[PDB]
Write an enzyme that holds these catalytic residues in place. Structure first.
Site, short mmCIF file in Angstrom:
data_model
loop_
_atom_site.label_atom_id
_atom_site.label_comp_id
_atom_site.label_asym_id
_atom_site.label_seq_id
_atom_site.Cartn_x
_atom_site.Cartn_y
_atom_site.Cartn_z
N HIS A 14 42.28 -29.08 -44.51
CA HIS A 14 42.18 -30.18 -43.56
C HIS A 14 41.46 -31.36 -44.23
O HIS A 14 40.82 -31.21 -45.27
CB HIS A 14 41.44 -29.73 -42.28
CG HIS A 14 40.21 -28.92 -42.55
ND1 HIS A 14 40.24 -27.55 -42.76
CD2 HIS A 14 38.91 -29.29 -42.67
CE1 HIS A 14 39.01 -27.12 -43.00
NE2 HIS A 14 38.18 -28.15 -42.92
N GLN A 16 41.25 -34.44 -46.52
CA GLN A 16 41.93 -35.15 -47.63
C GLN A 16 42.15 -34.37 -48.93
O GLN A 16 43.24 -34.40 -49.46
CB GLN A 16 41.21 -36.47 -47.98
CG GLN A 16 42.03 -37.34 -48.92
CD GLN A 16 41.41 -38.69 -49.27
OE1 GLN A 16 40.60 -39.25 -48.51
NE2 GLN A 16 41.82 -39.22 -50.41
N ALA A 17 41.10 -33.73 -49.47
CA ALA A 17 41.18 -33.13 -50.79
C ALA A 17 42.23 -32.02 -50.82
O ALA A 17 43.18 -32.07 -51.62
CB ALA A 17 39.81 -32.57 -51.21
N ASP A 72 45.14 -18.89 -33.68
CA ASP A 72 43.75 -18.58 -33.38
C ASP A 72 43.35 -17.42 -34.29
O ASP A 72 43.75 -16.28 -34.08
CB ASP A 72 43.56 -18.21 -31.91
CG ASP A 72 42.10 -18.25 -31.47
OD1 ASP A 72 41.22 -18.08 -32.33
OD2 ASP A 72 41.73 -18.46 -30.30
N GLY A 97 34.31 -24.22 -46.62
CA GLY A 97 32.88 -24.28 -46.86
C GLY A 97 32.31 -22.99 -47.44
O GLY A 97 32.98 -21.97 -47.44
N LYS A 136 26.64 -30.15 -47.88
CA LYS A 136 27.93 -30.61 -47.32
C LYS A 136 28.27 -31.93 -47.97
O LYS A 136 27.40 -32.80 -48.09
CB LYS A 136 27.86 -30.78 -45.78
CG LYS A 136 29.25 -30.93 -45.10
CD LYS A 136 29.17 -31.27 -43.58
CE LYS A 136 30.51 -31.81 -43.01
NZ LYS A 136 30.52 -31.91 -41.50
N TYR A 138 31.14 -35.11 -48.21
CA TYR A 138 32.27 -36.03 -48.00
C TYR A 138 32.51 -36.89 -49.26
O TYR A 138 31.64 -37.05 -50.05
CB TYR A 138 31.97 -37.06 -46.88
CG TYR A 138 32.00 -36.58 -45.45
CD1 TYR A 138 30.84 -36.12 -44.84
CD2 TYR A 138 33.16 -36.62 -44.69
CE1 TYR A 138 30.84 -35.68 -43.53
CE2 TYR A 138 33.17 -36.18 -43.37
CZ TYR A 138 32.00 -35.71 -42.80
OH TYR A 138 31.95 -35.26 -41.50
N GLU A 139 33.70 -37.49 -49.36
CA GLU A 139 34.09 -38.53 -50.35
C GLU A 139 32.95 -39.24 -51.13
O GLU A 139 32.73 -38.95 -52.31
CB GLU A 139 34.93 -39.58 -49.63
CG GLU A 139 35.44 -40.74 -50.48
CD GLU A 139 36.21 -40.26 -51.68
OE1 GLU A 139 37.21 -39.52 -51.49
OE2 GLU A 139 35.80 -40.62 -52.80
N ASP A 168 37.81 -37.07 -53.03
CA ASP A 168 38.67 -36.25 -52.18
C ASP A 168 40.00 -36.00 -52.89
O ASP A 168 40.21 -34.92 -53.40
CB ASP A 168 38.87 -36.89 -50.79
CG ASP A 168 37.72 -36.58 -49.80
OD1 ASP A 168 36.63 -36.11 -50.23
OD2 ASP A 168 37.81 -36.80 -48.55
N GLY A 259 34.48 -49.34 -72.33
CA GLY A 259 34.86 -48.58 -73.53
C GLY A 259 34.64 -49.33 -74.84
O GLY A 259 33.70 -50.13 -74.97
N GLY A 260 35.51 -49.08 -75.82
CA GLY A 260 35.46 -49.76 -77.10
C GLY A 260 36.03 -51.18 -77.10
O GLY A 260 35.93 -51.86 -78.12
#
Lengths: 427, 427
Positions: A14, A16-17, A72, A97, A136, A138-139, A168, A259-260
């Site tokens: 559920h 995003q990720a 269920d 989780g 916990k 989030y993003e 995510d 970067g370079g």
């Protein structure tokens, strides 16, 4: 012929990720069965809806190429139903989780028993064994934990989150790598594995270049290409200089190259009225001659001060301030076309308005119009990997429980049992 | 044992994107032969060196678990060597540019004839068929092209690059998905495919959430979770109002929540003096009573102006400002532990220095000390995916041409036939 045709994905994810991972597997041909709680379903359905009582664009853009069952799982007959699905599944994907799937009655150990071939794939905030293993995330919390926030933005502003979903969707894509790698192992051993990606680690992986810079800083006490190393350019709070004296951890460098190859964000005509009227301009060393020709500075071609990376690093901002004067009467795309004459690495900041309706992105299948006869069509991002032997066919997101009975028939159940499962409220 | 054991990888890539991809495949067991230009090699070897004449941390952190051969591919004896290697390879990976591999003699069509099982993988700036097919792009240009820059930063500032490598490493991780998908497909067809990832497309995939926002903006005229939805909060540099009455493209929202629930970056105790003394703090919808207890505003629990997402829209930034007030006397980690007692999603901005010395990251194999007796040990980021049935073994990056003889001898060539190549300067 479609890479993941015949791969059965039991999908508990559920937000995003997770959903990003299984959607993309769906785009590559996998048979994705989304298990959703009875009545509610994925919390994205009701998240910032643009029309009341219609699944949101957050939901639709992350759940195409999936079927939905309501179930269920706190129920004895539902746990039994899962057991059958698990026996037919190739991969289960989850983001419940730290100990939740076990608490639901489904240990990794028990899962291996039910099906020696199934792959258990999980997204978490922090890696197992980590001290913050139970925090916990989030993003933006993951962007903060993984070093991105500390190193993004400006030296005189706060740590800054990226608009890109570093936490995510990036974690979801890393999890897709893990699942595909476990599929390759299974072809030899005949057995599934447990794979997990932590959001902190997916972010750290994209922030590899900053851990490079942290070591450089530790060893030398300076990062000579950063804005803080230029002669009195950056200032603290009280009007005075900044420098790598007293900087011990990688600082924010604004719009530096990272970067370079030095770069900056340069204003173009319209910047005062349009937030996205800018170009990014990179000084690639191998074509400093071409840059000199474009900006009409022939003196800089033959001058050790402006003609090597080493000569250049002490006055980058003066060089960028000057290139920028050349762009004041030209829009983004004019500047870009001008630079493409010399093969220069310069391109426009594209706004979301421009990208959503760009004909090229639609031609190549990167932005896709989804035919959704229930809700009305919507745009989405398609598969960012293009293959010679296959094109994805993107299909609209499922209504909550739309495919329940269809999926139950596929297991091998009668019209008798299905109608009683609806009466008992397990579906 | 290891997922990509037995997979021979022919690696032409230089810089960051391709090299990240092949390194990660190497971490997963692949046999990666990096083909480099005679005398020069990957340009990262010489970029941002911390010790003169030693391969930079830039190169070593992207080229562990690889071997290096020098090969002049423009010579006819070089092209013959390549043919023998392609017949032995499972995947070729390149980032040369649009027509470049084809001009070198090796079209996709000829590659198939030499080895009908080989997979050709490419990183590009823009997708084939795009109007900008021909534009030159590096990291921050790709970020600009894919929407990240336009939607990262603050509404009163410029488009902002992300510290994370959204363009380069992200592109490489996306290409890894494509390669792994081609390998799963090949188990069925016995045939290799061509895969390509455009950097713009890899960026856009991560910015999917902002394409959601763009459609929400077009459909409704507002993005209620953004700072600009609070009246008289956001102003441009000239002091003009910024509201969704006039915004038609997804704006920069500073430290707003993205695909997470509403949040903000809040200052902790050190902030005037420590650039990274902040937490990210989220106001999740289901957690309002908890927040009210934490900040001692019991009066806000039953008040409709405060106790729903919708009621908070006109004042959300004032609420964050008041929450921040309670962190003035507490550091990062104290605030995090305090919030954690309430189950509130809240974590610290980890500095690169803190990340480089964190024991948890070293324990879980995410930050790894590579043993390098030649250059001295260094840290790198390991595999962000963790598996139940195997552990990566990271070994030091190759010196230029270190493995040339070794590689030629595995091809079949005997000793005197190799000596003729060293003299004729093919190797």
């Amino acid at each position: 012929t479609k890479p993941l045709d015949g791969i059965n994905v039991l999908d508990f994810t559920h937000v995003q990720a997770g959903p990003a991972c299984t959607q993309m597997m769906g785009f590559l041909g996998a048979n994705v069965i989304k298990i959703e709680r009875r009545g509610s379903g994925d919390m994205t359905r009701g998240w910032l809806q643009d029309k009341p009582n219609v699944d949101s664009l957050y939901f639709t853009m992350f759940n195409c190429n999936k079927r939905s069952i309501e179930l269920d799982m706190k129920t004895p007959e539902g746990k039994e139903l899962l057991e059958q699905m698990i026996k037919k599944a190739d991969v289960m994907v989850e983001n419940f989780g730290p100990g939740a799937l076990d608490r639901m009655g489904f240990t990794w150990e028990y899962i291996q028993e039910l099906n020696p071939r199934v792959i258990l794939a999980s997204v978490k905030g922090y890696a197992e064994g980590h001290a913050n293993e139970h925090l916990k995330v989030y993003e933006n919390v993951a962007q903060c934990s993984g070093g991105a926030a500390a190193t993004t933005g400006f030296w005189d502003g706060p740590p800054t989150v990226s608009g890109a979903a570093l936490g995510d969707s990036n974690s979801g894509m890393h999890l897709m790598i893990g699942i595909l790698a476990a599929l390759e192992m299974r072809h030899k051993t005949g057995r599934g594995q447990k794979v997990a990606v932590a959001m902190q680690d997916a972010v750290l992986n994209l922030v590899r270049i900053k851990l490079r810079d942290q070591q450089r800083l530790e060893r030398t006490g300076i990062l000579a290409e950063y804005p803080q190393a230029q002669p009195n350019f950056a200032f603290d709070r009280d009007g005075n200089p900044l420098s790598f004296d007293n900087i011990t951890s990688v600082p924010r460098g604004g719009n530096a190259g990272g970067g370079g190859q030095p770069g900056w964000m340069l204003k173009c005509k319209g910047w005062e009225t349009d937030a996205d009227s800018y170009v990014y301009f990179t000084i690639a060393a191998n074509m400093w001659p071409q840059i000199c020709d474009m900006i009409d500075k022939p003196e800089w071609k033959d001058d050790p001060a402006y003609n090597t990376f080493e000569g250049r690093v002490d006055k980058l901002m003066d060089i960028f301030s000057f290139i920028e004067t050349k762009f004041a009467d030209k829009d983004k795309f004019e500047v870009t076309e001008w630079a493409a004459q010399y093969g220069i690495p310069c391109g426009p900041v594209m706004s979301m308005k421009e990208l959503a309706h760009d004909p090229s992105l639609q031609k190549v299948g990167t932005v896709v119009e989804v035919v959704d006869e229930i809700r009305g069509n919507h745009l989405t991002v398609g598969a960012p990997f293009k293959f010679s032997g296959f094109q994805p066919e993107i299909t609209r997101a499922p209504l909550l429980g739309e495919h329940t009975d269809e999926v139950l028939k596929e297991l091998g159940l009668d019209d008798a049992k299905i109608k009683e499962l609806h009466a008992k409220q397990v579906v």
